[PDB]
Amino acid sequence: RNDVAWYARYPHILEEATRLPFAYPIGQYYDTGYSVASATEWSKYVDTSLTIPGVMCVNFTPTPGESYNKNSPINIAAQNVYTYVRHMNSGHANYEQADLMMYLLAMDSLYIFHSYVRKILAISKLYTPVNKYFPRALLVALGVDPEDVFANQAQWEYFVNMVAYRAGAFAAPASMTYYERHAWMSNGLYVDQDVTRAQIYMFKPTMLWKYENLGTTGTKLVPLMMPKAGDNRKLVDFQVLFNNLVSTMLGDEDFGIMSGDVFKAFGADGLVKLLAVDSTTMTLPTYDPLILAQIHSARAVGAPILETSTLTGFPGRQWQITQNPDVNNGAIIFHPSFGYDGQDHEELSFRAMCSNMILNLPGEAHSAEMIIEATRLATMFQVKAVPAGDTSKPVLYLPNGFGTEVVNDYTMISVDKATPHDLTIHTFFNNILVPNAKENYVANLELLNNIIQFDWAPQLYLTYGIAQESFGPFAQLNDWTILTGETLARMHEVCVTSMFDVPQMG
Amino acid sequence: TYVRHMNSGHANYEQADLMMYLLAMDSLYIFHSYVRKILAISKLYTPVNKYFP
Numbered sequence A: 001r002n003d004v005a006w007y008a009r010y011p012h013i014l015e016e017a018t019r020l021p022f023a024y025p026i027g028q029y030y031d032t033g034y035s036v037a038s039a040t041e042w043s044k045y046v047d048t049s050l051t052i053p054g055v056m057c058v059n060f061t062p063t064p065g066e067s068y069n070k071n072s073p074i075n076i077a078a079q080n081v082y083t084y085v086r087h088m089n090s091g092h093a094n095y096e097q098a099d100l101m102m103y104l105l106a107m108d109s110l111y112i113f114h115s116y117v118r119k120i121l122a123i124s125k126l127y128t129p130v131n132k133y134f135p136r137a138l139l140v141a142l143g144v145d146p147e148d149v150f151a152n153q154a155q156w157e158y159f160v161n162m163v164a165y166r167a168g169a170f171a172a173p174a175s176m177t178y179y180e181r182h183a184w185m186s187n188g189l190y191v192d193q194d195v196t197r198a199q200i201y202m203f204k205p206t207m208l209w210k211y212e213n214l215g216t217t218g219t220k221l222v223p224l225m226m227p228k229a230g231d232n233r234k235l236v237d238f239q240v241l242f243n244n245l246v247s248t249m250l251g252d253e254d255f256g257i258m259s260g261d262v263f264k265a266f267g268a269d270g271l272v273k274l275l276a277v278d279s280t281t282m283t284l285p286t287y288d289p290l291i292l293a294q295i296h297s298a299r300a301v302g303a304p305i306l307e308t309s310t311l312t313g314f315p316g317r318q319w320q321i322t323q324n325p326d327v328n329n330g331a332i333i334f335h336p337s338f339g340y341d342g343q344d345h346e347e348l349s350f351r352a353m354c355s356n357m358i359l360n361l362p363g364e365a366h367s368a369e370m371i372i373e374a375t376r377l378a379t380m381f382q383v384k385a386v387p388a389g390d391t392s393k394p395v396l397y398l399p400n401g402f403g404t405e406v407v408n409d410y411t412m413i414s415v416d417k418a419t420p421h422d423l424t425i426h427t428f429f430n431n432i433l434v435p436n437a438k439e440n441y442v443a444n445l446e447l448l449n450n451i452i453q454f455d456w457a458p459q460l461y462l463t464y465g466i467a468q469e470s471f472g473p474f475a476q477l478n479d480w481t482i483l484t485g486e487t488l489a490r491m492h493e494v495c496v497t498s499m500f501d502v503p504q505m506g
Numbered sequence B: 001t002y003v004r005h006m007n008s009g010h011a012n013y014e015q016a017d018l019m020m021y022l023l024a025m026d027s028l029y030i031f032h033s034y035v036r037k038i039l040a041i042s043k044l045y046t047p048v049n050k051y052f053p
Helices: A011-017 A037-041 A073-086 A097-123 A136-141 A146-151 A153-167 A177-186 A235-245 A253-265 A289-296 A348-354 A368-373 A438-451 A485-499 B015-041
Strands: A055-062 A200-205 A207-210 A220-225 A358-361 A381-384 A397-399 A405-415 A423-428 A431-434 A460-464 A469-474 A479-482
Touching (some): A055 A097, A055 A207, A073 A097, A073 A253, A097 A153, A097 A177, A153 A235, A177 A485, A200 A289, A348 A381, A348 A460, A348 A469, A438 A460
Antiparallel strands (some): A381 A397
């Protein structure tokens, strides 16, 4: 006997038969060819296409967390930060506690805008040969014309540096981890897996909050919609958005008084610091398992309701943080209605979000910080909003609670399988309607296969038009649990409390 | 007089608003120790007293 293996007797045969090219670049359409050469007689019955997506952008909206009355966590936080600022600024101050908190929320929307345009500037340096989505797909997902950023690099750099210089002239506490959380989410690129051909997660604000001081009936934060993906917006549009954001704050006396008071209370080492940007500044896609766990359990709440929204049967449901001194004893009030999808109709997919959510985690041992960070983008409906009128085309919902930000949409950027193989923009909620047409089933299947390329992708709740039936969470579960509205509301009420937290005076 | 001559500045409340705030604080602390006693009694076991808890 010899008892040596065949692969050890001829290792050259094995190493020659298995030399294959791997690491195909993504961002590029690939045609697989035919194994049966005669199968071109079957036109669409043979799928020879292979498109890999690269960008899924989480479209979000910063919130204070469901204010109903003066006992809300943002009003308790307003009380604590005004007690801290007031007993560090001995003198005569004219603003209330809620004017100070609304100044802090407008400061947050400014910092999100600055990190947004800085991400537009810092993405455009990204190149790698093995991912062709860099950097144009990431710029398409942020709503900017990518050629405008390359052609006007110095004007863009001046604009973002002047946004940092202007918006950085107002003080905000860095002891609040609210600003640090939005800076963490809003200027980071996140891979779904620690590989080089990984797929990118991003966070883009759907809307920001514009201050809008009015009359004598307090203040009223109103939405300012950001560019959506596929819009080829240029630098002048972002300049108009910036000037619309700080129109009521630049060179304003009351905002300067509040900024100097926050400067004197929290010292210069205890304020937030905006980041500068040059031609050297670039961000690299990092692996963060805390980001992926809350992208996984994210639930999209729909489009923001504006003044120009024409909700049939739902007047006055526009999203606004209000501070009327004659209403609710002068409490900061924010309770938006969810389930709006931009149009004046029912959107039957939101019925699929009326079941209890699934909280899915990797591993088998879960920390309390891990569990509470994995639930930060989740938002469950609790009741239906009451239709005021005879008929009502849409159906709105009221949650039990939400965190410092709600998800509005997701935007997936892939390549088209038809020539010239340009990028494709697909915007979706967690819920997806498939109406009865032949051009919807294979397209929905393509979208589902595109979504399952993303590792900790949000859980899908599809529904069918002729089946009258929603299917549950389309996601691979590892170690799951069923959450109810009260548990998630407890976690939201904990996290809104922790984000708006300041120390004491001693 | 103690709080006013440690908080140099303009205060709007009277002496009696401060004392009523202190009494309401006492009722809050009694409520907290009450529900904490509800929570801390429920651990008590002994075989020789079946009234626990």
